[PDB]
């Protein structure tokens, strides 16, 4: 039944749960299928070899490189199988050219040489354990069937699609269980003819496009009704139709807007799917808007085409998603590359048929050849949304396919676009195939039957170690208002309430001659009261986000940090906080997470010297009088390699890390000098301005740390190869990118439960064993109807993974902290929303309450 598909937009406009939206678990059921796709003109190549016929794409290549110099795959059977053997995929998807055996204008003499290759390939796949998913038509047309017949506009070409089908089953035998008749009819019909961007035609009114699609639709009718009358008795496989569709989201979620969106699918998906599953008639939407330029069915052929399919085959990728697609049936609507909310629409619309995706993938630029980091994570979110569909949607998905096993030609963007699973160079006479990152991920996906629970992924029971530090973070506290915090902090069971002082406000001019003691006595009273209610707060001095970098106006216009003297200026302020506020503090932070990519190198040497002078003073003059521990807090956003099995990502992983974490840590934590990798990189590229450490200065920096205040907000990726000339750092040879399969914030801040684990272990390996902290970790709001969805997963899994280091590996911990307990001082980040000039506990507050009072998961 039709019309019922309008519910899928509202059904998936409100995600029932982030766990369903994330789906970090689950496995595919027994019998689920896997295959890898390829195109006829993308990879095969050659047009006189062994008797191959000419193609329309040959003419299109001359005047809009060429498919005559493709990756030499027409007679070798071990080149692709070697890629198949590594993949180990149970099925393989490809296409057969129309002109290979019948290039004549009347289906002339078949060429046995082309048959011998495909018989060889079919026999090879059986031995390895691979079965084919073949398509008899992939955007190709014979030349001699074009000039005489004048393109797909003529009806007689549908007859030529039938006799060729008579040999498709016979020549390839009965082994081929699955079949696709025509792939992506829409782009062949409209963009193939009307716009002329594709192989045939030079220009055409939309009048030709509707007729061409109509003839192609009957071509499906021609090929099915042959199968059930001549082949199925000696068979039992299924033949289906693949339709290319793109999801559409409403602009304003309006009844007429969703009607347009529902109508929009009908011009792309319902153009052929409507009369092949449900009733054999064209959609009523076209009959209204399109007056008479759309050909209509007759009564005899309406029944001839009704229900001519067994399962729905689906298409996605760069074919018509944010790519070649006519603006007219866009209906001024946005595009979204989603599978979970499109697979449901097909299941409800067409009376619940089985689904088998035939073409799906994404593309990378032509410059990248080794690390196709873009294609890996685009591919994985696709295999996410099928698992979300089978489990959380009830739609039966029988298999999945990955596009572009081998690189080829994109038919409109030239060779500037690469998509193959295995990269082949353009300067090789042998066209040797090499493994890629995507193939490695696909290698470790089938043998695991999906994404089964893992010891790291599966939560592990544990108990919190005693004397575990706690507290919330507010580094923008405004200096009358003491009571609301302590009342809220006491309910929070805080032990070390983390905050700062806003040093710029501490000293109006940066000198001790004058100072406003009103804000100085603010901290003394609040810290002492916190001790009465059992809080020993965390103190911070300097902040990275400030117009003047936290320095007064006088101290900001004269080399704010480049001045050698301003280190002494920070030194007097160090005594200022220690001489009065040091009695009620046990845990100290001086440089609260400086940003480590914009800050100048030359002034960076100053910052490392400032801590050394500051740490010595409190140690040799105040540590004995008042006991305490003083160390530093550094930005430690984990840099995970994009491909875990790629060595090049590993070396560049430290370079961004070392300039971020090691630049302000190696002089402090390590031997006392800069990391080796950052010293060589400056020397190798003949670019250097970073000063060295003198012998007297080296001993100052080293050893001035007691604890380690790791900061971890997210887990960003690293990429060595340049992808775009805008967001790839030439100086570091590092491309920043974020995995999008993760639960992403509305501000595009990812959540990674395992990201805290690796950085926790990594810092111990370089800097030895020491009492480590986690000083900064938090997430924003999200899903603005119940703001607990992203945070019920954030803090539950982050702290659980944090204890996994203690139980499994053995990295020592002493405290865990949460960021921005309120939203007034941190937009979008708050736990207590600032609504109606009041702070209220968002339901995740109980979630954070339970773990704190219970002190970890209650063990057996």
Distance of alpha carbon 333 from the chain centroid = 24
Tell the burial category of 571 from Cβ atoms under 10 Å away from its Cβ (0-12, 13-18, 19+): middle
Of 446, 463, 494, which marks where a domain is finished? 446
What are the distances in angstroms from CA 548 to CA 45, 413, 552, 558, 584?
62, 47, 7, 11, 29
Dihedral (Cα; 503, 505, 507, 510), 10-degree rounding? 70
Contacts of 689 by beta carbon, 8 Å cutoff, 6+ apart: 601, 602
Return contacts of 509-517, CB within 8 angstroms, 24+ apart. 509/552, 509/553, 509/554, 509/555, 510/551, 510/552, 510/554, 510/555, 510/569, 511/554, 512/572, 512/576, 515/576
Contact 472, 821 (CB under 8 A): yes
Distance of alpha carbon 659 from the chain centroid = 25
Pairing state between β 838-841 and 832-835: antiparallel
DSSP codes, 119-188: HHHHHHHHHHT-EEEEES-SS--BSHHHHTTTGGGSTHHHHHHHHHHHHHHHHH-S---EEEEEE-HHII
For 52, which DSSP code? P
Residues 345 and 206 in one domain: yes
Contact 654, 718 (CB under 8 A): no
Contact 248, 335 (CB under 8 A): yes
Residues 73 and 170 in one domain: yes
The count of residues in the chain is 860
Q: How far is the C-alpha of 768 from the C-alpha of 764, rounded, in Å? A: 5
For residue 286, the surrounding DSSP H or E stretch is: helix 284-289
Q: How far is the C-alpha of 773 from the C-alpha of 752, rounded, in Å? A: 18
For residue 273, the surrounding DSSP H or E stretch is: helix 270-277
Among 493, 580, 577, which residue's Cα sits nearest to residue 530?
A: 493
Q: How far is the C-alpha of 547 from the C-alpha of 398, rounded, in Å? A: 57
Among 814, 58, 856, 211, which residue's Cα sits nearest to residue 470?
A: 814
Contact 348, 389 (CB under 8 A): no
Q: How far is the C-alpha of 522 from the C-alpha of 504, rounded, in Å? A: 16
Q: How far is the C-alpha of 816 from the C-alpha of 495, rounded, in Å? A: 11
**Domain of 60: which CATH number?**
3.20.20.80
Tokens representing residue 716 in the block: 């960003």
Tell the burial category of 19 from Cβ atoms under 10 Å away from its Cβ (0-12, 13-18, 19+): middle
Q: How far is the C-alpha of 715 from the C-alpha of 756, rounded, in Å? A: 8
- CA pseudo-torsion sign 392, 395, 397, 402: negative
Residues 504 and 410 in one domain: no
Is residue 300 classed as helix, strand or coil in its secondary structure?
Answer: helix
Residues 802 and 717 in one domain: yes
Residues 558 and 504 in one domain: yes
Q: How far is the C-alpha of 556 from the C-alpha of 523, rounded, in Å? A: 25
What are the distances in angstroms from CA 5 to CA 305, 338, 538?
22, 16, 55
Q: How far is the C-alpha of 226 from the C-alpha of 165, rounded, in Å? A: 8
Burial 118-129 (b: 16+ CB within 10 A, else e): beebbebbeeee
- CA pseudo-torsion sign 345, 349, 352, 354: negative
Q: How far is the C-alpha of 399 from the C-alpha of 11, rounded, in Å? A: 24
Is 451 part of a structural domain of the chain?
no
Is 467 part of a structural domain of the chain?
no
For 808, which DSSP code? I
Contact 18, 789 (CB under 8 A): yes
Tell the burial category of 532 from Cβ atoms under 10 Å away from its Cβ (0-12, 13-18, 19+): exposed
Breaks (C-N over 2.5 A) in the chain follow: 64, 479
Is 860 part of a structural domain of the chain?
no
Q: H helices of 460-516, where?
A: 482-491, 503-506
Contact 143, 55 (CB under 8 A): yes
Is 458 part of a structural domain of the chain?
no
Q: How far is the C-alpha of 287 from the C-alpha of 845, rounded, in Å? A: 55
Is residue 755 classed as helix, strand or coil in its secondary structure?
Answer: helix
Contact 739, 376 (CB under 8 A): no
| Integer Rg of the chain from CA | 33
Helix 156-172 with 206-230: angle, nearest 10 deg: 40
Tokens representing residue 377 in the block: 């994570």
Residues 296 and 371 in one domain: yes
Helix 482-491 with 517-532: angle, nearest 10 deg: 30
Residues 662 and 515 in one domain: yes
Residues 59 and 191 in one domain: yes
Residues 98 and 216 in one domain: yes
Is 463 part of a structural domain of the chain?
no
Tell me the backbone φ, ψ of residue 289, rounded to 5 degrees: -70, -40
Is 72 part of a structural domain of the chain?
yes
Domain count, the chain: 2
Expressed as residue numbers, the domain containing 334 is: 4-446
Contacts of 443 by beta carbon, 8 Å cutoff, 6+ apart: 86, 87, 88
Among 229, 263, 266, which residue's Cα sits nearest to residue 245?
A: 266
Helix 844-854 with 789-804: angle, nearest 10 deg: 20
Among 713, 666, 725, which residue's Cα sits nearest to residue 690?
A: 666
How many Å is the maximal CA-CA distance in the chain? 102
Residues 179 and 274 in one domain: yes
Tokens representing residue 736 in the block: 């920043």
Pairing state between β 708-711 and 838-841: unpaired
Contact 135, 95 (CB under 8 A): yes
Residues 419 and 519 in one domain: no
Q: How far is the C-alpha of 710 from the C-alpha of 637, rounded, in Å? A: 9
Among 208, 215, 206, which residue's Cα sits nearest to residue 328?
A: 206
Contacts of 52 by beta carbon, 8 Å cutoff, 6+ apart: 46, 74, 97, 99, 100, 103, 111, 114
Resolution (angstroms) equals 3.3
Is 460 part of a structural domain of the chain?
no
Ramachandran bin of 306, using left for φ above 0, alpha for ψ from -120 to 50, beta for the remaining angles: beta
The residues pairing with 58 across neighbouring beta strands, listed in sequence order, are none
Residues 113 and 233 in one domain: yes
Residue bearing tokens 């027994």: 30
For residue 359, the surrounding DSSP H or E stretch is: strand 354-359
Contact 668, 747 (CB under 8 A): no
What are the distances in angstroms from CA 511 to CA 49, 506, 507, 554, 576?
85, 10, 7, 9, 11
Is 329 part of a structural domain of the chain?
yes
């Amino acid at each position: 039944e039709p019309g019922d598909g309008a519910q899928t937009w509202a059904r998936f406009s409100r995600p029932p749960a982030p766990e369903a939206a994330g789906l970090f678990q689950g496995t595919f059921p027994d019998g689920f299928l896997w295959a890898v796709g390829s195109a006829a003109y993308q990879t095969e190549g050659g047009w006189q070899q062994h008797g191959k016929g000419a193609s329309i794409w040959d003419t299109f290549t001359h005047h809009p490189a060429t498919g005559d110099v493709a990756s030499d795959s027409y007679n070798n059977v071990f080149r692709d199988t070697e890629a198949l053997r590594e993949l180990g995929v149970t099925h393989y998807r490809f296409s057969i050219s129309w002109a290979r055996v019948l290039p004549n204008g009347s289906a002339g003499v078949p060429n046995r040489e082309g048959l011998r290759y495909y018989r060889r390939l079919l026999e090879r796949l059986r031995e390895l354990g691979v079965q084919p998913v073949v398509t008899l038509y992939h955007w190709d047309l014979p030349q001699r069937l074009q000039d005489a017949y004048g393109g797909w506009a003529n009806r007689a070409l549908a007859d030529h699609f039938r006799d060729y089908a008579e040999l498709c089953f016979r020549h390839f035998g009965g082994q081929v269980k699955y079949w696709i008749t025509i792939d992506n009819p829409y782009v062949v019909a409209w963009h193939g003819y009307a716009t002329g961007r594709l192989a045939p035609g030079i220009r055409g009114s939309p009048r030709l496009g509707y007729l061409v699609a109509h003839n192609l639709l009957l071509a499906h009718a021609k090929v099915w009704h042959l199968y059930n009358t001549s082949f199925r008795p000696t068979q039992g496989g299924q033949v289906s139709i693949a339709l290319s569709s793109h999801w559409i989201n409403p602009r304003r979620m309006t009844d007429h807007s969703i009607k347009e969106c529902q109508k929009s699918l009908d011009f792309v998906l319902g153009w052929f799917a409507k009369p092949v599953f449900i009733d054999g008639d064209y959609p009523e939407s076209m009959k209204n808007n399109l007056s008479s330029i759309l050909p209509d069915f007759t009564e005899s052929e309406k029944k001839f085409i009704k229900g001519t399919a067994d399962f729905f085959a689906l298409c996605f990728g760069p074919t018509l998603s944010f790519q070649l697609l006519d603006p007219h049936m866009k209906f001024r609507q946005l595009e979204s590359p989603n599978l979970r909310q499109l697979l449901s629409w097909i299941d409800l619309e067409f009376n619940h048929p089985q689904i088998f995706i035939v073409e799906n993938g994404w593309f990378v630029s032509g410059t990248t050849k080794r690390d196709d980091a873009k294609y890996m994570y685009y591919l994985k979110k696709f295999i996410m949304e099928t698992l979300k569909a089978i489990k959380l949607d009830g739609v039966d998905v029988i298999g999945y396919t990955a596009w572009s096993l081998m690189d080829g030609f994109e038919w409109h963007r030239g060779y500037s676009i690469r998509r193959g699973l295995f990269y082949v160079d353009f300067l090789s006479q042998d066209k040797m195939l090499l493994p890629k990152s995507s193939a490695l991920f696909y290698q470790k996906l089938i043998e695991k039957n999906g994404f089964p629970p893992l010891p790291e992924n599966q939560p592990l029971e544990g108990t919190f170690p005693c004397d575990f530090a706690w507290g919330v973070v507010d580094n923008y506290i405004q200096v009358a208002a003491i009571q609301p915090q302590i009342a809220l902090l006491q309910e929070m069971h805080v032990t070390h309430f983390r905050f700062s002082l806003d040093w710029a406000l501490i000293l109006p001019l940066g000198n001790q001659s004058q100072v406003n003691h009103t804000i100085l006595q603010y901290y003394r009273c609040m810290a002492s009261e916190l001790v009465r209610v059992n809080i020993t707060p965390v103190v911070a001095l300097w902040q990275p986000m400030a117009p003047n970098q936290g320095l007064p106006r006088l101290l900001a216009r004269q080399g704010a940090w480049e001045n050698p003297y301003t280190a002494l200026a920070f030194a007097e302020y160090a005594r200022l906080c220690f001489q009065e506020l040091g009695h009620h503090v046990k845990l100290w932070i001086t440089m609260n997470e400086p940003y480590t990519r914009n800050m100048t190198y030359s002034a960076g040497h100053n910052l490392l010297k400032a801590h050394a002078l500051a740490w010595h003073v409190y140690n040799e003059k105040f540590r004995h009088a008042q006991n305490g521990k003083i160390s530093i807090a550094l930005q430690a956003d984990w840099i995970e390699p994009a491909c875990p099995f790629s060595q090049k990502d590993k070396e560049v992983a430290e370079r961004v890390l070392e300039f971020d974490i090691g630049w302000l840590a190696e002089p402090i934590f390590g031997s006392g000098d800069y990391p080796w990798v950052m010293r060589d990189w400056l020397n190798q590229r003949n670019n250097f301005l970073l000063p060295y450490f003198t012998e007297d200065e080296k001993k100052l920096i080293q050893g001035t740390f007691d604890f380690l205040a790791l900061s971890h907000y997210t887990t960003i990726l690293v990429d060595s190869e340049k992808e775009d000339p805008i967001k790839y750092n030439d100086y570091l040879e590092v491309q920043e990118m974020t995995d999008i399969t993760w639960l992403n914030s509305p501000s595009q801040v990812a959540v990674v439960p395992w990201g805290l684990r690796k950085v926790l272990n990594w810092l111990k390996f370089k800097y030895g064993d020491l009492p480590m902290y986690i000083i900064s970790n938090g997430i924003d709001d999200g899903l603005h109807a119940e703001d607990d969805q992203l945070r019920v997963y954030y803090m539950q899994n982050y702290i659980n993974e944090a204890l996994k280091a203690h139980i499994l590996d053995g990295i020592n911990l002493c405290g865990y902290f949460a960021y921005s307990f309120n939203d007034r001082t941190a937009p979008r980040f708050g736990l207590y929303r600032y609504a109606a000039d009041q702070f209220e506990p968002k339901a995740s507050m109980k979630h954070y309450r339970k773990i704190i009072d219970s002190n970890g998961f209650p063990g057996p």
